[PDB]
Swiss-Prot record, chain B:
Adapter protein implicated in the regulation of a large spectrum of both general and specialized signaling pathways. Binds to a large number of partners, usually by recognition of a phosphoserine or phosphothreonine motif. Binding generally results in the modulation of the activity of the binding partner. Negative regulator of osteogenesis. Blocks the nuclear translocation of the phosphorylated form (by AKT1) of SRPK2 and antagonizes its stimulatory effect on cyclin D1 expression resulting in blockage of neuronal apoptosis elicited by SRPK2. The keyword Lipoprotein does not apply. The modification N6-acetyllysine is found at K3, K49, K68, K115. Gene3D superfamilies: 14-3-3 domain (1.20.190.20). This is 14-3-3 protein beta/alpha. The record marks R56, R127 as: Interaction with phosphoserine on interacting protein. GO terms for biological process: negative regulation of DNA-templated transcription; negative regulation of G protein-coupled receptor signaling pathway; negative regulation of protein import into nucleus; positive regulation of transcription by RNA polymerase II; protein localization; protein targeting; signal transduction. Homodimer. Interacts with SAMSN1 and PRKCE. Interacts with AKAP13. Interacts with SSH1 and TORC2/CRTC2. Interacts with ABL1; the interaction results in cytoplasmic location of ABL1 and inhibition of cABL-mediated apoptosis. Interacts with ROR2 (dimer); the interaction results in phosphorylation of YWHAB on tyrosine residues. Interacts with GAB2. Interacts with YAP1 (phosphorylated form). Interacts with the phosphorylated (by AKT1) form of SRPK2. Interacts with PKA-phosphorylated AANAT. Interacts with MYO1C. Interacts with SIRT2. Interacts with the 'Thr-369' phosphorylated form of DAPK2. Its main location: cytoplasm. The modification 3'-nitrotyrosine is found at Y82, Y104. GO terms for cellular component: cytoplasm; cytosol; extracellular exosome; focal adhesion; melanosome; membrane; nucleus; perinuclear region of cytoplasm.
Length: 231, 230
């Protein structure tokens, strides 16, 4: 099967709600090593969001049942083994995505918006590993998660306008990450305020017909600031 | 694996909506070769109903797409090839279930309630094969569905109460078989009306444990009878 055929197969699998097929199709597309179109990039992102989402969902369901269980019914030990089977798949799916990002997507990215998309995706997929990571492996995945967002963060700052909706929103994502996962409320606030203020300073340059493309995300940065400072 | 284990695994898979796992667990329980319990029997049924249901839905989605005009020869090829993938899967799923029915479930059925349940199941899964069958495979598969339903129907009339869900569901499915597979509204209406009237003529055979299931399926029978006439 060639790229055109795989892409079509991918859209058919989406329609049929067969997301693993959809993901396998777009994995193979990605492996031709060429920069993906917006259509293709969207398809891959969707494909894997859904495949990863289903196991995450299954895992939340099992963890919850495990904790309502009486703690030596040999049933309890099914929920252990089963959760662990889910986890291993979840990690397998994540490793695929990360391999694609390391090997093809990030290195071939020619434009800064694509490079930032893929770096953030890498950040997101490490975050999913961390949700089922063990003790000492859990700090590794969070650092790997931070570093990917940091790298994307730096590129937006350097290649995009303060007012750009991807830069904002990466600012938002990254600030929330410092707050929610790294327990750093002061860095979280510092980050948000800087993003907010920088875009504020260039409100000047926006078109009255589409300023909300920027303004809506800035409102969220601001909302978080007042929320986080109120604590 | 202990059954209670496999059955547990199966109840978790179900909660987790991982129906392929659920089905494998129940497959390995059925293969231990012993009559299933009402609960293991329902888990096996629910399992395969969801596993095969997902492909029946995917197939239709794709058959419907392949129905719009398509100027692109490669896109038309992929649609054809993808439908064919789903069918092969669908057929494999049905064959698994029919093997289980032939090798274990039906021959070991030791009471009429189960025997009807499994024959009804044999009909259903031969109906699903019919939906994607071709030529002579389709005459065989349709005919096999009718035989198994018909046989179940005779036993359910002879041994079960009119308001029993297994019996009402058989009528439901067998009436739907006649409408959708045999393209015969006359035979589908006659069956559904008989089973409904027979139920309502014996409300005394209702019981608390299955009142909701009985009425739910009676209402579905009714729905179908209105739709099919109007």
């Amino acid at each position: 099967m060639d790229k055109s055929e795989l892409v079509q197969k991918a859209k058919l699998a989406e329609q049929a709600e067969r997301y693993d097929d959809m993901a396998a199709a777009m994995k193979a597309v990605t492996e031709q090593g060429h920069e993906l179109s917006n259509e293709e990039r969207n398809l891959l992102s969707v494909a894997y969001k859904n495949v990863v989402g289903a196991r995450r969902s299954s895992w939340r369901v099992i963890s919850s049942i495990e904790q309502k269980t009486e703690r030596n019914e040999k049933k309890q030990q099914m929920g252990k083994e089963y959760r662990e089977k889910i986890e291993a798949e979840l990690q397998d799916i994540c490793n695929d995505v990360l391999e694609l990002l390391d090997k093809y997507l990030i290195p071939n990215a020619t434009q800064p918006e694509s490079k930032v998309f893929y770096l953030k995706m890498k950040g997101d997929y490490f975050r999913y590993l961390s949700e089922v990571a063990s003790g000492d492996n859990k700090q590794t995945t969070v650092s790997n998660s931070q570093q990917a967002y940091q790298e994307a963060f730096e590129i937006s700052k350097k290649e995009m306008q303060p007012t750009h909706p991807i830069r904002l929103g990466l600012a938002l994502n990254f600030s929330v990450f410092y707050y929610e996962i790294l327990n750093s409320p002061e860095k979280a606030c510092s980050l948000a305020k800087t993003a907010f203020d920088e875009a504020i300073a260039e409100l000047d340059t926006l078109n009255e017909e589409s300023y909300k493309d920027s303004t809506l995300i800035m409102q969220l940065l601001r909302d978080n600031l007042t929320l986080w400072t109120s604590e």
